[model samples]
Target: GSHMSNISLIVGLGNPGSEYAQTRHNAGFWFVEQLADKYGITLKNDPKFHGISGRGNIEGHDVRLLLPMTYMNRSGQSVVPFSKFYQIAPEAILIAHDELDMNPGVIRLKTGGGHGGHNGLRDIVPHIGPNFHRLRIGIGHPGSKERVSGHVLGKAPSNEQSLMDGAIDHALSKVKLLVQGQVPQAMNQINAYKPA
Candidate 1:
């Protein structure tokens, strides 16, 4: 059975290839990179999971990290096997992805919400259900929904890039607290923080 007591897997949703790199949709990948650098974990391609993976200890708890290669709309193709093989429950998984609802650089954490039409989450939901935690990394939105695709796919201005990077740093710092099962404290710390 999957353990729901603590976070076991952290999945950073993004697309594959240079074409998608540095795009807003790749915020999740940035988060994992920070975590790996901070904790000294090395991620490598794992064919079985259809992604790159790393396993290490954080805040004294064993944790696994995954970066799906199944592309944004098919993230579940990687997450499903990775979760089941390790017995990770839906509740113990954290799915970090770009959020268009907030202003640029905003970071929010929540549990069990709908996918918000995110192709990544929309694909992951059926396989893992909606019980997993989500780290919404704000990338802001275009003036109209029609322009959103281009906005997220295109690179952010240098200033906006700095803002997004700062947000990732802030969220990464609080992850240890979350790993220790201090959800309220983590949430409070993140919510109380004002982005630049």
Candidate 2:
């Protein structure tokens, strides 16, 4: 059944609405915007794609982009329909979500991993199964466990915003590489790149 799939779906996880737009918690959405803007592609709200969506070429391959609007905690709601409609294999999915354990400037591309307590991720795995890929953007834990909620929802200090910007640009490379079907190289490229 999975052998017939041809489309690749790139999903960036985050909450919807203006209030949640630029927060560190919404790294998934921000990263998608960076990639879209680089190619002059526009992502408008679309319920069919789960949130905002568009199409374009990267590394010489056509691809679909998605941002889930199920809000952060319930993100998987969007993945199921989007994947089924396009005949996309779970292995062809790229999910970009934030990781509290990672520093703001770090980007990690993992094939499959646990949700690590992320509600968005928690909701996703059960629906997509564990065979999909994940792009975990590190947000770093800013507060003690007692303040975990405030930490993720809180905006980063201005000093760190530049790092976030740089990281987002670096992360976009993985998206390009993935679209080209250069998965193994893309995996190593992202994990091994040393900022110059």
Candidate 3:
């Protein structure tokens, strides 16, 4: 229940199933999967936690990583349970997710910010309380409101997909710094480091 290493949890928000696997709305989950791949960890189905769960050391911190299965609009349902069970505070959690306000390949790491109309974050703030860290992977806004849902849930065009693959790989490396409780440093290091 307690992490001897340091981090309490690394929670990535997203919907479940193969259908939404590569969608823009699930960018958070995509990054987490990349992390798992880098570490050679597999996130098998774990019904008890409401989604797949993985455990590992991120920057020497023993962590319980979670991917919520409660659907995008109500992601908090599982987050609340996971936090309460582990006795992890809002600050001890890092949520890697998407933000429509920012452009693709651009990432934002912040705490206690507005959801900017992201339903996933909107639901989580109420349950986990606002004081939390977030790694927002920009998905960019759709040109029209009518295009919002498909834009998020649908596949990215070929050009964007290639860029996103690179971005996800870049993000996977920076996670260790974040899990070690050096969020600001991680943000600076990641944002500054130009991928080779």
Candidate 4:
């Protein structure tokens, strides 16, 4: 009965600037860039949105892509203003971000979950609540909690980076299902993918 398109805005969370560009923490930004390239959407710095933003059609549905310019811990600052101006509900937004719990090459999609110590999610939750969908791209955890900062901020080895790319590509392939509001179908296919 819920046949309307489920997503109108897709946000990729990360710190801005060249320093953090290639770090594992920026996997979310990488995913958005890939999506933009595939759709021929040109993301540009938009002062009002406080991010790089663009609008395009995906799976015949109009969608907006945002890469917040604020650092990971202040992601909501950019997100909230943009969504408010556009009247995009939290549930209709999908936030793609790196996850430490799962290993590299793994990705999962879910909605309305706890932040699990992710800085981006931690910041966004209070602004809009936790109803937004998530695209969790695994970056693999460091051996201990203390090493987490370096692990996320550091670039991955070539082998692990390749695996992460594979997972992103896999998610790209099934994105139409998400656009069309067939989340369960998309999840079934995407969650089972293992990078080759």
Candidate 5:
């Protein structure tokens, strides 16, 4: 296993059901899919954990990928149990979720902060605390705060969808670096990326 950092668990946040499949709210799910695809693994259901999970190698570490089957507002239900089962520390988890503050195709990485109105993060924070690293995939805002729900759950316009894909792919490129605990390097690459 890799020893570059203590990180061992990676959680990709989103609601379950195919209905929410392509929506902006699934950006985190999108990342997980790409990750699984990249490593030729399958994220399967685990009734006990109440979500899908798969094991893969990231920079020589046996990293676990998790996706909550619970609704967006109750993500911690899955996170806490998995963390407990694996004995992974709060600081060893990395969560990826959509961010409304940045434009489409923008990506940001950081550790410990407010959930910034993301219900998934808001819910997971209490169970895991604010110390886990975050990979925020930009989905852009919907003009007013009230419109957020519809905006995130609804389908993105084609152009924005393309931008979002670009962002996810860009972030995808840094997974190995991230797993190796080269966060600063990964962040630099992510920040320098521009949508094509």
Candidate 6:
């Protein structure tokens, strides 16, 4: 018996603009794109929502995807309005964002924790608190706090990019279980995945 709730909204945190498109911090956006493609959801910019958003069904469950365009530090500005509009609870939202602690190919899924110094998560917390689920997409660390800004803002080499892509694929494959509220099962598979 797991307490995890079915996800109603999926929000990917990233900065807006082409310059940040391929950067390490944009892994969250990459995941949302892959998901939208897989589900045939067309994400479009909606000023009312303050982001790029779309609604679709996944495994018979209605879900919404959002990519906040308010930049990394002001992610809440985009997420809060959309979630509130749909009456989506924080527990039913899955926020995907880059993780600095894990390797490029590794990922983790969890719920209700501190932001771990992530500006995106940090900003989102003041609006929604820490009850939402998170899909932590690893981008690898730069080995020093001073270099972190540069590392996350920079593009990874081809090999690392591929690894990150592979990890995203693994995470995307678990959407069915996630939408069905089988979060522990989804976590078991996603967390155990190792990109070759």
Ranking by lDDT: 6, 4, 1, 5, 2, 3
Off by over 4 Å in 3: 1-6, 193-196
Which ten-residue region of model 1 has the weakest summed lDDT?
A: 1-10
lDDT, candidate 3, residue 104?
A: 73
Candidate-wise lDDT, in order: 0.86, 0.77, 0.77, 0.89, 0.85, 0.90
Task: Indicate which candidate wins on lDDT.
Answer: 6
- Provide the TM-score for each candidate, comma-separated: 0.96, 0.89, 0.89, 0.96, 0.94, 0.96
The sequence of per-residue lDDT tens digits that candidate 3 reaches over residues 1-196 is: 5433234677788888899988898888988777877776667776766777787765566777788998988788788787887788887888888877876767767767777788888888877778777877877788888888988998888767666666667777777777677777877866653324
Give one digit per residue, the lDDT tens place, for model 2 in 1-196. 2332232777888888888887788888888878778776678878765678887766566677888888888787787787788778888888888889888777878887788888888987887787788778888886688887888887888756666677778778667677766678778878765444
Cα error, candidate 2, residue 182 (Å)? 1.6
Model 2 gets an lDDT of 0.77
Q: What is the number of backbone collisions in each predicted candidate, taken in the order shown?
A: 0, 0, 0, 0, 0, 0
Indicate the TM-score of model 5: 0.94
Q: Write model 4 residue lDDT over 1-196, tens digit each, in one string.
A: 1124478888999889899999999999999999999988889988887799999899798889999998999898899989888888887888999999989999999889889899989988898999888999999999898998999999999999999999999998887888888888988998998886
Candidate 6 colliding pairs: none
Candidate 2 is scored at a TM of 0.89
Stretches off by above 4 angstroms in model 5 are 1-6
- Candidate that beats the other on TM-score, 5 or 6, i.e. the better one: 6
Per-residue lDDT of 1-196 in model 1, one digit per residue for the tens? 3465477788999989999989999999989978988998889989898999999999898899999999888898999989999999988888889998876778888889888978899988887789888888889888898897898888999888888888888999998987887877887887665664
